[PDB]
PDB file of N, CA and C in Angstrom:
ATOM      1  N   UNK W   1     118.273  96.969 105.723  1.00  0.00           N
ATOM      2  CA  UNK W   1     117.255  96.679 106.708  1.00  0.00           C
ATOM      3  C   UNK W   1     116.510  95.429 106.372  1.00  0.00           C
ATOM      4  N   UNK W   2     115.781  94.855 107.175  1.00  0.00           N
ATOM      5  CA  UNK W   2     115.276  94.063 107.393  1.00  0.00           C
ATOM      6  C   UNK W   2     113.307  93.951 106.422  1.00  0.00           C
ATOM      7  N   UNK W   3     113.782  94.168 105.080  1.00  0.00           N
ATOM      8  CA  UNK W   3     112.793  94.500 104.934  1.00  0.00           C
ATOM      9  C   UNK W   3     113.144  95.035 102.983  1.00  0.00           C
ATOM     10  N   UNK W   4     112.081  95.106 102.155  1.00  0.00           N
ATOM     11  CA  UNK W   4     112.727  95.054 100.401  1.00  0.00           C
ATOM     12  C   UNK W   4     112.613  96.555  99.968  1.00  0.00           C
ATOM     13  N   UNK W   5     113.091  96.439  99.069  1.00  0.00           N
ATOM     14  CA  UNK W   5     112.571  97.837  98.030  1.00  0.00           C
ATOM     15  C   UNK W   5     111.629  98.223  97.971  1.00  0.00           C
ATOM     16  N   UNK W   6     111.378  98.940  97.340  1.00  0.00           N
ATOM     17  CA  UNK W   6     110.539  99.637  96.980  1.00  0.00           C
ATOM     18  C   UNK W   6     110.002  99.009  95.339  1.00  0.00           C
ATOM     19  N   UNK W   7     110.770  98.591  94.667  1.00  0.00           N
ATOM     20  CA  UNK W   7     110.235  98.237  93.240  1.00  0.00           C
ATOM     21  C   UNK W   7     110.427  96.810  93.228  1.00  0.00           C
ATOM     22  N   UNK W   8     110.264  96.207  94.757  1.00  0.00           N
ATOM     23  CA  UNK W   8     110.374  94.618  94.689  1.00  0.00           C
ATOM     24  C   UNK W   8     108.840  93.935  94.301  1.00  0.00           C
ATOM     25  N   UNK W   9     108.508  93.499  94.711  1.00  0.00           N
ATOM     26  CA  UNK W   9     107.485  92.842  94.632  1.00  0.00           C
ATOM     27  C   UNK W   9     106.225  93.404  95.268  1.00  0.00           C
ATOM     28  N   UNK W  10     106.178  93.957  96.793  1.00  0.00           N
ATOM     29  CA  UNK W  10     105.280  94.145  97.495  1.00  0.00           C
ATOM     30  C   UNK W  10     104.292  93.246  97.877  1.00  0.00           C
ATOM     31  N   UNK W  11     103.557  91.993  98.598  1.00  0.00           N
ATOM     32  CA  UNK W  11     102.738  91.308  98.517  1.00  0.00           C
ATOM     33  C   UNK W  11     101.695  91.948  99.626  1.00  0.00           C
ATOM     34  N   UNK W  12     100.417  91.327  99.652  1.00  0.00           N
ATOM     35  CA  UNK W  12      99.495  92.071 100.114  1.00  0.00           C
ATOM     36  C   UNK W  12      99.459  91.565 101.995  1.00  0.00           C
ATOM     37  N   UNK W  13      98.698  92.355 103.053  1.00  0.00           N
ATOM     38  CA  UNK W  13      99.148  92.314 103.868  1.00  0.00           C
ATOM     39  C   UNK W  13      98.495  90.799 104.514  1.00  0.00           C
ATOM     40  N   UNK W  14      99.009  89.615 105.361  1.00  0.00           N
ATOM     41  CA  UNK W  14      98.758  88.331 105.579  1.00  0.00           C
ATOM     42  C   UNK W  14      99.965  88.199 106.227  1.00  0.00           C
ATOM     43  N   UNK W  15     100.007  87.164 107.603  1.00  0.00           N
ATOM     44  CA  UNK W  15     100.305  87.234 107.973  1.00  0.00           C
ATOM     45  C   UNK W  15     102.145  86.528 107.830  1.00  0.00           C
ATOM     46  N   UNK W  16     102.834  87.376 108.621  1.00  0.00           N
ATOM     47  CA  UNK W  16     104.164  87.394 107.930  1.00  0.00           C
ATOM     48  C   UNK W  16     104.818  87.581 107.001  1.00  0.00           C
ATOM     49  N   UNK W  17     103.940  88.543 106.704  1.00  0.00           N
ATOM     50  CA  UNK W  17     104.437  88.819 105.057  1.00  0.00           C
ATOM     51  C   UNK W  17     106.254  89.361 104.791  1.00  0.00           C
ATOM     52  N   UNK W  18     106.456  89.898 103.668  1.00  0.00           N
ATOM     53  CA  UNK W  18     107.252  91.046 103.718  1.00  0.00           C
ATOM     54  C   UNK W  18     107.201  92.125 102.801  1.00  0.00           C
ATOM     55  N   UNK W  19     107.155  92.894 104.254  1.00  0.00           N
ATOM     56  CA  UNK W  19     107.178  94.562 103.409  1.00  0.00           C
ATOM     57  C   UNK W  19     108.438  95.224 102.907  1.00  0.00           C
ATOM     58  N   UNK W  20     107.740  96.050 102.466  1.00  0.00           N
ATOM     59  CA  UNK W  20     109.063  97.268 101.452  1.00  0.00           C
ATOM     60  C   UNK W  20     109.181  97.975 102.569  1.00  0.00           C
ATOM     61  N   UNK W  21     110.579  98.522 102.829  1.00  0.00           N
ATOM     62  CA  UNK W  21     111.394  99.440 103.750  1.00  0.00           C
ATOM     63  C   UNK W  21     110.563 100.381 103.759  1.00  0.00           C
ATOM     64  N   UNK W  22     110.862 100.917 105.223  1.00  0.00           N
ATOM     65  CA  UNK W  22     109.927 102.372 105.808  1.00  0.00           C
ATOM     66  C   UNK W  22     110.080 103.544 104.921  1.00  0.00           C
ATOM     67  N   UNK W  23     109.222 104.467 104.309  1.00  0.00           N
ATOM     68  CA  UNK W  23     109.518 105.291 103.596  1.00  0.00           C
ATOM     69  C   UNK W  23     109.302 105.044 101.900  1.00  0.00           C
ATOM     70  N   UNK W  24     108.220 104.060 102.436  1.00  0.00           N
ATOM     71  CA  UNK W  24     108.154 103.680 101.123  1.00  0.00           C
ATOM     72  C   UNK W  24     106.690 103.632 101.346  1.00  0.00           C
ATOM     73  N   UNK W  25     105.704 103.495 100.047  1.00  0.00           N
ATOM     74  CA  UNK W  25     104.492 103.515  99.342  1.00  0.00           C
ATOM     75  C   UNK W  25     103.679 102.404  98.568  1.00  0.00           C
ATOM     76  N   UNK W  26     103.200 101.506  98.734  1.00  0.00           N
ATOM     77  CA  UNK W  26     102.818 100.358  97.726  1.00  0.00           C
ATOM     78  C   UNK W  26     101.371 101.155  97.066  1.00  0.00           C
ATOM     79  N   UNK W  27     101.859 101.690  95.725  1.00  0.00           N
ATOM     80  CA  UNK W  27     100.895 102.067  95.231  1.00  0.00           C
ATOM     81  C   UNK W  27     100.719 101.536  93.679  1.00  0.00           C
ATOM     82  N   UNK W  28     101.564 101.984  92.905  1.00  0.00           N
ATOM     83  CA  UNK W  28     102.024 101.581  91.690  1.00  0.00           C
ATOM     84  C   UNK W  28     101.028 100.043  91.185  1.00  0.00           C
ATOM     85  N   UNK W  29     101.874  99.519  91.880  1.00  0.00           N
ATOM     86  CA  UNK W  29     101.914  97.880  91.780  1.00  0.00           C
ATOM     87  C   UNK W  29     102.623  97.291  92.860  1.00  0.00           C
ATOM     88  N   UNK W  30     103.990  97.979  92.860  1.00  0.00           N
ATOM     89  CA  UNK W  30     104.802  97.732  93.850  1.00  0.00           C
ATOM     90  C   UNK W  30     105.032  99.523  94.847  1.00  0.00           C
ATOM     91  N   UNK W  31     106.050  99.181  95.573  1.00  0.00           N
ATOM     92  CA  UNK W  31     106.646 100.110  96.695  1.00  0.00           C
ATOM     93  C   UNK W  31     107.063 101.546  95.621  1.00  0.00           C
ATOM     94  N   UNK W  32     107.159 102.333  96.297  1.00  0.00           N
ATOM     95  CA  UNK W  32     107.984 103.220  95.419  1.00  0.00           C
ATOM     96  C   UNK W  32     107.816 104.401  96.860  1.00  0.00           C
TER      97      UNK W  32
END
C-alpha cells in the first residue's frame, strides 16, 4: 500500500506527510 510500516520512521502530522499503513499505531517512537 501506499503508505510505510509500522517500525519505519513515522513523522509527525504536516502537510503531506507519510504515514504508516492503516492498522497501525505511532506510539513507541514509531508505528507499531
Amino acid at each position: 500500500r501506499d503508505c510505510q510500516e509500522k517500525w519505519e520512521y513515522c513523522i509527525v502530522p504536516i502537510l503531506g506527510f507519510v504515514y504508516c499503513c492503516p492498522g497501525l499505531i505511532c506510539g513507541p517512537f514509531v508505528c507499531v
